[PDB]
Coordinates of C-alpha atoms in Angstrom, one line a residue:
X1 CA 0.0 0.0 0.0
X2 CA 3.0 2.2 1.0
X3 CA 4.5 1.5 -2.4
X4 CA 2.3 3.9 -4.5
X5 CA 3.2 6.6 -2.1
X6 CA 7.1 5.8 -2.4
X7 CA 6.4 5.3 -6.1
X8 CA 4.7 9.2 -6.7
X9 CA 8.1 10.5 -5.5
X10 CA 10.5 12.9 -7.7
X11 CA 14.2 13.2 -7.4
X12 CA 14.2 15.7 -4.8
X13 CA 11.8 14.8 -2.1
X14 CA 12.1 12.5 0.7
X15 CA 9.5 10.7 2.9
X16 CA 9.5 9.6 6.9
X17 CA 7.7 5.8 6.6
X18 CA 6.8 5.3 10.8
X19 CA 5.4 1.8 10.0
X20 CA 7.1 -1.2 11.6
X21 CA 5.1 -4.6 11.0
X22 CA 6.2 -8.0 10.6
X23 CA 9.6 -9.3 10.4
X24 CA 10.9 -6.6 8.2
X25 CA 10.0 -3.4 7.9
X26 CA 13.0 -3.2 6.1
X27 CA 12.2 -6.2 3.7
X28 CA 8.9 -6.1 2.8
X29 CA 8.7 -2.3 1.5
X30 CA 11.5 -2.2 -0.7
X31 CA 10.5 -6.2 -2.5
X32 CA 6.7 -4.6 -2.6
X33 CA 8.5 -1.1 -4.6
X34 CA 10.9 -3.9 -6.7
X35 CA 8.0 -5.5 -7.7
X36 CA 6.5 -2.1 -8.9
X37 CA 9.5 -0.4 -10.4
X38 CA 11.0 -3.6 -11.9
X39 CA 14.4 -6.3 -11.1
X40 CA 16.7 -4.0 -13.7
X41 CA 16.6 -1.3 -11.0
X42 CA 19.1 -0.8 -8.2
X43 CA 17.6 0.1 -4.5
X44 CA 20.0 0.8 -2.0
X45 CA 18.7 -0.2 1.6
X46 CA 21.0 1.2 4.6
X47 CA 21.6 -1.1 7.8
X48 CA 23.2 0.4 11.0
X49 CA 25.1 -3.0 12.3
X50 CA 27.1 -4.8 9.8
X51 CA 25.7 -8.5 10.7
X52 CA 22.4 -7.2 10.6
X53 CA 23.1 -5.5 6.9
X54 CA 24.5 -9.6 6.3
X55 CA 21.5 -11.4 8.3
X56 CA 19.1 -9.6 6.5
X57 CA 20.7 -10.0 3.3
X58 CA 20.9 -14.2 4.0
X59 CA 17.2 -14.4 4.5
X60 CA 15.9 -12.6 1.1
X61 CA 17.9 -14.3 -1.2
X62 CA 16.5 -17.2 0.5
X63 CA 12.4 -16.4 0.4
X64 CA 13.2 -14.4 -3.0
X65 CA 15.2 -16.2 -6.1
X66 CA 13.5 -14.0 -8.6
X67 CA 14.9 -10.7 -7.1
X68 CA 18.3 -10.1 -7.1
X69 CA 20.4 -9.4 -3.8
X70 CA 23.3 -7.8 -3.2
X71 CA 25.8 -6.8 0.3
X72 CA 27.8 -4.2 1.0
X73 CA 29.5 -4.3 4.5
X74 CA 33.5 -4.6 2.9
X75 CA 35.6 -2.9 1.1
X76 CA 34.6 -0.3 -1.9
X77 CA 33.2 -1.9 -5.5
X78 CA 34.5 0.7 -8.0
X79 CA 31.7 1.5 -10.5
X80 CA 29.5 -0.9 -9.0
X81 CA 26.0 -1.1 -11.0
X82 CA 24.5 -4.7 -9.4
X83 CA 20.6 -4.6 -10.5
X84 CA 18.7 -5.6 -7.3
X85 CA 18.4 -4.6 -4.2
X86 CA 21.8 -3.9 -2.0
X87 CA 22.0 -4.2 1.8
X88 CA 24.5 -2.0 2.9
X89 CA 25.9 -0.6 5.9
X90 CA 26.9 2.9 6.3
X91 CA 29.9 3.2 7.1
X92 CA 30.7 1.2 3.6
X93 CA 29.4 4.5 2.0
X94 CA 31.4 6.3 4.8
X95 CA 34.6 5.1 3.4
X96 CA 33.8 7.2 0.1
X97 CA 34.8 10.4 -1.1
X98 CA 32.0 12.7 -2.2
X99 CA 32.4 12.7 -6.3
X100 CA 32.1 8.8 -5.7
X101 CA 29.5 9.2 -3.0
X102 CA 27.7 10.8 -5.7
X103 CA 28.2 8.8 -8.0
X104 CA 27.4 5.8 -6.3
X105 CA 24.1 7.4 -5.0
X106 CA 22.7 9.0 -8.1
X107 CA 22.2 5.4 -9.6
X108 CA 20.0 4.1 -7.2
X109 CA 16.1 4.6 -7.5
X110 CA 15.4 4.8 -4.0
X111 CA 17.6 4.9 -0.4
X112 CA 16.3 3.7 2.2
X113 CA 17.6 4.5 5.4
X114 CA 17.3 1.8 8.0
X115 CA 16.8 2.9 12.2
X116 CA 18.3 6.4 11.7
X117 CA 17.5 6.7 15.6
X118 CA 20.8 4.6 16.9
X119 CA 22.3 7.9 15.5
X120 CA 26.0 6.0 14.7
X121 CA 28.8 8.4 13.8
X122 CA 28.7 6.4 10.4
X123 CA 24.7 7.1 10.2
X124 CA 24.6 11.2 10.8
X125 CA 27.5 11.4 8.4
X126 CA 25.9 9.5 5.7
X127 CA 22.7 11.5 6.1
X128 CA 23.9 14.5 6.1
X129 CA 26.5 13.9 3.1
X130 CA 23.6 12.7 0.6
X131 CA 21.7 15.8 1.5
X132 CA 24.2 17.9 0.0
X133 CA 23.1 16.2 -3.5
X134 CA 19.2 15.5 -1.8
X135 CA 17.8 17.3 -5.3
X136 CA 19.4 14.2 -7.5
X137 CA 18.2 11.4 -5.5
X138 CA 14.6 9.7 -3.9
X139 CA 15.1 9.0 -0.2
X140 CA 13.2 7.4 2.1
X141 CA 14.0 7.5 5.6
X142 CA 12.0 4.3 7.8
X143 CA 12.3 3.4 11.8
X144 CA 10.5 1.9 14.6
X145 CA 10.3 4.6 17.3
X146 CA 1.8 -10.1 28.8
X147 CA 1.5 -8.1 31.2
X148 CA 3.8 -5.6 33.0
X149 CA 3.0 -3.9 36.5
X150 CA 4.1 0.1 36.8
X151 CA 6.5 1.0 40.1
X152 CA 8.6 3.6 40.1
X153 CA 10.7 2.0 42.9
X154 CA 12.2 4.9 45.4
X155 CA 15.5 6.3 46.2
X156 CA 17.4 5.1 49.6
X157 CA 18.3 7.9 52.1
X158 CA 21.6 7.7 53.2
X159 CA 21.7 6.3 57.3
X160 CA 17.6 5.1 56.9
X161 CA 16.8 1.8 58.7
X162 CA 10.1 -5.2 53.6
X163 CA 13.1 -4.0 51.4
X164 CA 16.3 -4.1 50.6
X165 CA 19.2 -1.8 49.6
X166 CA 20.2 -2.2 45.8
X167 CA 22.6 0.8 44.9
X168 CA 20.2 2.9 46.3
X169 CA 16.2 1.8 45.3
X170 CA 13.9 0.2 47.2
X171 CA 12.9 -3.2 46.2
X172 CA 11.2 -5.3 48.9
X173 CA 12.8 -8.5 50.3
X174 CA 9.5 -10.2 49.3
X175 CA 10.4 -9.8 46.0
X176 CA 13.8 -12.0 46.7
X177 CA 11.2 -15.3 46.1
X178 CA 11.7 -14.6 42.2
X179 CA 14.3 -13.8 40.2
X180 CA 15.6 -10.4 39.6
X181 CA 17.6 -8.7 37.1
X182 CA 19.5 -5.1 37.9
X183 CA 20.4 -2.5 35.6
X184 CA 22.5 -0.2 36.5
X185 CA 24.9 2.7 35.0
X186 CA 28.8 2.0 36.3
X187 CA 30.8 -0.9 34.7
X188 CA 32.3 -1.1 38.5
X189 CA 28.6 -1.7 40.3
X190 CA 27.9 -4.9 38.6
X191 CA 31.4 -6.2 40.0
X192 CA 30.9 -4.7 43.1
X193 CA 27.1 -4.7 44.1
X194 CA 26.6 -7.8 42.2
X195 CA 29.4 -9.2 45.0
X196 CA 27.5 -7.8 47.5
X197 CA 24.2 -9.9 46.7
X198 CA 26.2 -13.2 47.5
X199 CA 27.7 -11.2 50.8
X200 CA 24.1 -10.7 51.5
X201 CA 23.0 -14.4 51.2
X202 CA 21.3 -14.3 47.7
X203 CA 22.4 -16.5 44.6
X204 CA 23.9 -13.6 42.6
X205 CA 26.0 -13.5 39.4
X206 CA 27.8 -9.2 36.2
X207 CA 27.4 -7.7 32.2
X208 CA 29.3 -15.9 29.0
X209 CA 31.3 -18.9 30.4
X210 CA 30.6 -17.3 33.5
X211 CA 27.0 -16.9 33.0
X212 CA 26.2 -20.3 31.9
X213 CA 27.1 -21.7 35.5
X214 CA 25.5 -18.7 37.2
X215 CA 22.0 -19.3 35.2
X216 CA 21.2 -22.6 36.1
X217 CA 20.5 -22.7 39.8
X218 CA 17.8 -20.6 41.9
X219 CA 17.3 -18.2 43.4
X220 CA 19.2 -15.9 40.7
X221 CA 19.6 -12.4 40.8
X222 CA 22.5 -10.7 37.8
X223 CA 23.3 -6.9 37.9
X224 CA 23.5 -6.6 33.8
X225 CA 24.5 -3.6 31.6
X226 CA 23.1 -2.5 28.1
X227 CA 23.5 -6.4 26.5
X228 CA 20.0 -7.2 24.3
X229 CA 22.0 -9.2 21.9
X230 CA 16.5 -14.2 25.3
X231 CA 17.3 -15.0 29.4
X232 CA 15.9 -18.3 30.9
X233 CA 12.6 -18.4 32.4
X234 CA 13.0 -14.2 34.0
X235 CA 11.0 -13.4 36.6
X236 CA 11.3 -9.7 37.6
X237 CA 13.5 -6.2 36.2
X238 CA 14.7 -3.6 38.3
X239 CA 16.1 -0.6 36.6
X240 CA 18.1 2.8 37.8
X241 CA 16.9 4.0 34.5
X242 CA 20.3 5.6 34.3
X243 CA 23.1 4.4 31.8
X244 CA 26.7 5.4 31.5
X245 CA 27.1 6.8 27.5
X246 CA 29.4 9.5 26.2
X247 CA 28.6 13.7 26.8
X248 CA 30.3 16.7 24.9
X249 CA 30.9 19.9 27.5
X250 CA 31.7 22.9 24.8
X251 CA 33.3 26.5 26.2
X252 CA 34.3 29.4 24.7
X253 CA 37.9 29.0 27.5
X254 CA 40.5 26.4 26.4
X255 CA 39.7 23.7 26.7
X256 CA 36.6 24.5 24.2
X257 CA 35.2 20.4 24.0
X258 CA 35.5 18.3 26.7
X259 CA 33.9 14.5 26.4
X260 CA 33.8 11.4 28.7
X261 CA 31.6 8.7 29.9
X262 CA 28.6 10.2 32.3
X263 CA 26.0 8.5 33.8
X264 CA 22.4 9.7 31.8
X265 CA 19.1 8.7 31.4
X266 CA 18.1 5.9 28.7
X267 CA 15.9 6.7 26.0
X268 CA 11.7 5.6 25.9
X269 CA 13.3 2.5 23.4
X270 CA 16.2 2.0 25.3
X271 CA 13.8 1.9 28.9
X272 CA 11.4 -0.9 26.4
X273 CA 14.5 -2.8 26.0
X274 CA 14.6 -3.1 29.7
X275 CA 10.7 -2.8 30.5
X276 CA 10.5 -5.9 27.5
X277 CA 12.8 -8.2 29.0
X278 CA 10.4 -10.3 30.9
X279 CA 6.7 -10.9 31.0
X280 CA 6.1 -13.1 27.8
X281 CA 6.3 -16.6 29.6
X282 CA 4.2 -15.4 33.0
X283 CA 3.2 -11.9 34.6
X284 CA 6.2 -10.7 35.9
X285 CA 7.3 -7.2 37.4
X286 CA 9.1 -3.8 36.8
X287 CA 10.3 -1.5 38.9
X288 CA 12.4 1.5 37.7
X289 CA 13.8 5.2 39.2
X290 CA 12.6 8.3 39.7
X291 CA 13.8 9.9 36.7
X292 CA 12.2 10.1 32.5
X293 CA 13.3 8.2 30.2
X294 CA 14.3 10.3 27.2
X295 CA 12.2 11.0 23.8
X296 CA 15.1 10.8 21.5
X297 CA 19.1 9.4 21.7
X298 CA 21.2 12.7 23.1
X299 CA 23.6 12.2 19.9
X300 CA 26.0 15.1 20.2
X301 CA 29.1 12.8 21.1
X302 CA 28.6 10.7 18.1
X303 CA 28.1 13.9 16.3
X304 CA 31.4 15.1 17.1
X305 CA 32.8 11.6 16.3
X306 CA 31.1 12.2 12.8
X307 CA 33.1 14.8 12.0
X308 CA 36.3 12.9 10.7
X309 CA 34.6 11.3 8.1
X310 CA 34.0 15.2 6.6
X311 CA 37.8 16.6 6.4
X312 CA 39.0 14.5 3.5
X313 CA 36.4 16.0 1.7
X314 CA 36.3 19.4 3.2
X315 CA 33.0 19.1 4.4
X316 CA 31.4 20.9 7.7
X317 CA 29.8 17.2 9.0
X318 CA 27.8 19.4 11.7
X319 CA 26.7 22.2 9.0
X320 CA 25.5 19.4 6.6
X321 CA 23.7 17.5 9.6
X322 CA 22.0 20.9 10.5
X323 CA 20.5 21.8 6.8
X324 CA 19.4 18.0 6.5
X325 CA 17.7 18.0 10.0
X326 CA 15.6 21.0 9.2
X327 CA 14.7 19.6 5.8
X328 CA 14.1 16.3 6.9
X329 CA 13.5 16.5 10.3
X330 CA 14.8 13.6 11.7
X331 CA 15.9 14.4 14.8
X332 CA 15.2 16.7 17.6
X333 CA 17.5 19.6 18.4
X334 CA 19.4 21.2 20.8
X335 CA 20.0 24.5 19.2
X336 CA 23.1 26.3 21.6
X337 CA 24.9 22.8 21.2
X338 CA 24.6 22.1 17.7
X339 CA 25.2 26.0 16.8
X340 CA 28.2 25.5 19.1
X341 CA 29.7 22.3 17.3
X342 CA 29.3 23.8 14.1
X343 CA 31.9 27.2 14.8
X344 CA 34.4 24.4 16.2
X345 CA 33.2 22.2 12.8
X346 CA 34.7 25.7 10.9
X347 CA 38.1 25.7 12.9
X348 CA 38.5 22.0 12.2
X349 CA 38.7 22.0 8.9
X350 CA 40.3 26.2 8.0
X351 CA 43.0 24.4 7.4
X352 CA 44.4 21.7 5.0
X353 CA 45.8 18.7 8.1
X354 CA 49.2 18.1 8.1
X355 CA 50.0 14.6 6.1
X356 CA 52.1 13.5 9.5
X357 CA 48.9 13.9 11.3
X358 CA 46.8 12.4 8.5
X359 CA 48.5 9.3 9.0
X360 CA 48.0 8.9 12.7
X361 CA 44.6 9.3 12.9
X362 CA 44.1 5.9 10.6
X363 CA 46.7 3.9 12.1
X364 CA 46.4 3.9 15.8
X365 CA 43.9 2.6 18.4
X366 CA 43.4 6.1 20.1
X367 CA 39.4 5.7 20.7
X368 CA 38.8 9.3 19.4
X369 CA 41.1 10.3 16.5
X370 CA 39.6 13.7 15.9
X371 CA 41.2 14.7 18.8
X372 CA 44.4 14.8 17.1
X373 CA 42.9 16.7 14.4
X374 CA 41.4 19.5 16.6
X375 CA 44.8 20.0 18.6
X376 CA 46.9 20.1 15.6
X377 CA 46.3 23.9 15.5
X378 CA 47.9 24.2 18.8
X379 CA 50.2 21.2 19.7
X380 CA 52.9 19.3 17.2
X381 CA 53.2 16.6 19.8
X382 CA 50.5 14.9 21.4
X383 CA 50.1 14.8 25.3
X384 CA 49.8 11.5 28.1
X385 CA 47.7 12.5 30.6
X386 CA 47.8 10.8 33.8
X387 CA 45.0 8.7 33.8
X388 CA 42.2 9.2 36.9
X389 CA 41.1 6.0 39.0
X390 CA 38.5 6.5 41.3
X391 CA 38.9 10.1 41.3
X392 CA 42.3 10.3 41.7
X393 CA 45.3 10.7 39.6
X394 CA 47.8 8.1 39.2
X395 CA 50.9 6.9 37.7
X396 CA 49.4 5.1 34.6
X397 CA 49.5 6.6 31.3
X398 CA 47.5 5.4 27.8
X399 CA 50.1 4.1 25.4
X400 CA 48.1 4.5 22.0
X401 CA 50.4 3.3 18.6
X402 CA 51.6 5.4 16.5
X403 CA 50.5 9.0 18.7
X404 CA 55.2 9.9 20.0
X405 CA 53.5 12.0 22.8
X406 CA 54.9 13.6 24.9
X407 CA 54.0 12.9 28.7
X408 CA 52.8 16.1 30.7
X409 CA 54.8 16.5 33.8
X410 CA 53.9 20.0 34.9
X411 CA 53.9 21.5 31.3
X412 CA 50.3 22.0 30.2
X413 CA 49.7 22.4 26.6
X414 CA 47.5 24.3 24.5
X415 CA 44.1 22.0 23.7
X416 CA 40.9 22.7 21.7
X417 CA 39.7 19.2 22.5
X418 CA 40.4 17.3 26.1
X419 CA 38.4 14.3 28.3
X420 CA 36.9 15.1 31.5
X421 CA 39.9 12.7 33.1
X422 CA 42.5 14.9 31.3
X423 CA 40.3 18.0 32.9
X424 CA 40.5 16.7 36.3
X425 CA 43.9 15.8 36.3
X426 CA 44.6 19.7 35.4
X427 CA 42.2 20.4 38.2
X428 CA 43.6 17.9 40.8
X429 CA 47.6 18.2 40.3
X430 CA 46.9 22.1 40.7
X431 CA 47.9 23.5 37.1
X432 CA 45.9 25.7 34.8
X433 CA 44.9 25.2 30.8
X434 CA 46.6 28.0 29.2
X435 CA 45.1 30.6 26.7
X436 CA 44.6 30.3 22.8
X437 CA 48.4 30.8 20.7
X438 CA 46.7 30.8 17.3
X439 CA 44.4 33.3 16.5
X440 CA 42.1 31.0 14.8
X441 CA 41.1 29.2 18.3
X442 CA 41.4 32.8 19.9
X443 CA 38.7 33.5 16.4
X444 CA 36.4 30.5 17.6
X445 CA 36.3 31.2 21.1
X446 CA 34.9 35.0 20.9
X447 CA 32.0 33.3 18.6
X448 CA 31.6 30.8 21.3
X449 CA 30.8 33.2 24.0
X450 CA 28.8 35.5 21.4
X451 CA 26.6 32.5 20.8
X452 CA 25.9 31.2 24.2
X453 CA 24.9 35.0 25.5
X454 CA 22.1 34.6 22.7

């Protein structure tokens, strides 16, 4: 039915399809538009995950010989023209340089862009990139946006004296007659309060060898984190609603970004990963915190992340993301942020990169790499911070390949772009950040204090 509403489009427009029935959303429409426009036409179909782009792909050559299939989750194909339908991921497109972007996009009939709400630094570069050339191309952008009893289970008081004390919520001890399943933000909680559980006198397990043992006897009670990749025979879910994901802190005073892990909210789809993980074999429970569940993903980090894959190409990732997003309208906005990003988005790339730098950035195991980039304007030699354990510094240092840092002692360098443990270590050893050298950082930070007082 859908198909005759993809099938009235023009080069030029896009359409949001909400609909999410069956096993494949993401099968069924583009086979039904196939069928209508013909097998001699390409239609590209985008895939976050690359063994999802590859499952899917298994399954309809498998319920569909007449239709051609084709995957795209490797390396490039150079004037690739295959006449069915491709499942691709995006970061296979993300490897390409706009004139072959282009020309790889332009032949397709239709793109279909597969749970644009993960928000992958792969996925808002992509989306953003084809917008650039959205008047050339037909694109279609698709997501998915027993009972279950409602307690928003309440915060423990420090020194208080029917319940029990789990990281701070109050579950009853009534409910340690079933079998329980904790979510909670830290990756050092479900070591260390999952230990407590079996210091406590209940069967208790953490996050696969490990958990096979664990699962079989009763009554069991695992502290898990954000691992949906079902769980035998669950009784009951207790969330923190909290998760620990990446944040980007922007100032107009050096350092201008700052990222890290923080502890945050989940998202409503997120929160139904957790509120949908029992119930269908018996009428179990769920108890989560006091505090909402987001509408969308905060994608900012990933946004910044995005970035990289724009300075080959000379392209303003964040700009491009801004002009598709009020097109399109994808994704919700926060406007002092994104404005914010964008003026850094213009120092990244007012300059050609140094080929030196260039080839650090694809060689080592650094988990941000534009971090390089965005110092490169201030710093020839990259930094060791000490690294921060439990709040405090230490001795250790990161040894990432290829970086020849220097380590800091007491000397404090020059940085557009630091981590919230590279922050603290300035705070805790007593040193200060010093001020902008080059004038195009000094340039970026008077915008970024224009644009946060409006």
């Amino acid at each position: 039915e859908m198909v005759k509403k993809i099938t009235s489009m023009n080069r030029g427009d896009f359409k949001q399809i909400t609909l999410a029935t069956g096993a494949g959303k993401t099968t069924e429409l583009p086979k039904a538009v196939i069928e209508e426009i013909g097998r001699h036409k390409r239609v590209l179909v985008l895939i976050p995950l690359r063994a999802a782009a590859e499952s899917v792909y298994q399954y309809m050559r498998l319920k569909h010989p007449s239709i051609s299939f084709n995957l795209r989750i490797g390396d490039m194909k150079e004037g690739d023209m295959a006449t069915g339908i491709t499942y691709a991921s995006y970061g296979y497109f993300c490897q390409m340089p706009q004139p072959k972007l282009r020309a790889a996009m332009v032949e397709y009939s239709y793109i279909f862009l597969d749970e644009y709400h993960c928000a992958t630094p792969e996925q808002l570069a992509i989306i953003g990139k084809i917008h650039r050339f959205s008047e050339s191309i037909r694109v279609v952008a698709m997501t998915a946006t027993h009972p279950i009893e409602e307690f928003i289970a309440p915060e423990v008081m420090k020194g208080e004296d029917q319940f029990l004390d789990i990281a701070g919520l109050k579950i009853p001890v009534d409910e340690m007659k079933g079998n329980m399943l904790v979510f909670v933000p830290t990756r050092n909680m479900a070591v260390e309060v999952a230990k407590k559980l079996k210091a406590k006198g209940y069967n208790s397990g953490y996050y696969p060898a490990n958990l096979r043992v664990v699962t079989s006897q009763s009554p069991y009670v695992i502290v898990a984190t954000n691992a949906i990749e079902t769980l035998p025979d669950l009784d009951t879910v207790i969330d923190t609603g909290l998760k620990c994901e990446k944040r980007v802190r922007v100032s107009s005073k050096i350092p201008f970004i700052v990222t890290g892990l923080k502890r945050m909210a989940v998202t409503v789809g997120e929160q139904a990963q957790r509120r949908g993980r029992v119930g269908r074999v018996k009428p179990g429970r769920y108890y989560r915190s006091q505090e909402t569940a987001t509408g969308s993903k905060d994608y900012h980090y990933d946004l910044l992340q995005a970035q990289r894959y724009g300075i080959e190409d000379g392209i303003n990732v964040t700009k491009s993301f801004r002009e598709m997003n009020y097109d399109w309208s994808l994704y919700e906005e926060d406007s002092l942020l994104i404005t914010q990003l964008e003026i850094l988005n213009n120092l990244l790339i007012s300059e050609d990169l140094p080929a030196a730098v260039k080839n650090i950035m694809a060689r080592t195991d650094h988990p941000e790499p534009i971090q390089l980039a965005y110092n490169s304007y201030e710093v020839q030699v990259p930094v060791l911070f000490p690294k921060i354990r439990n709040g405090e510094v230490t001795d250790t240092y990161e040894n990432y390949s290829f970086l020849n840092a220097r380590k800091l002692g007491e000397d404090v360098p020059v940085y557009i772009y630091a981590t919230e443990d590279e922050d603290l270590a300035v705070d805790l050893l007593g040193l200060d950040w010093p001020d902008p050298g080059n004038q195009q950082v000094v340039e970026t930070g008077k915008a970024l204090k224009q644009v946060t007082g409006l």
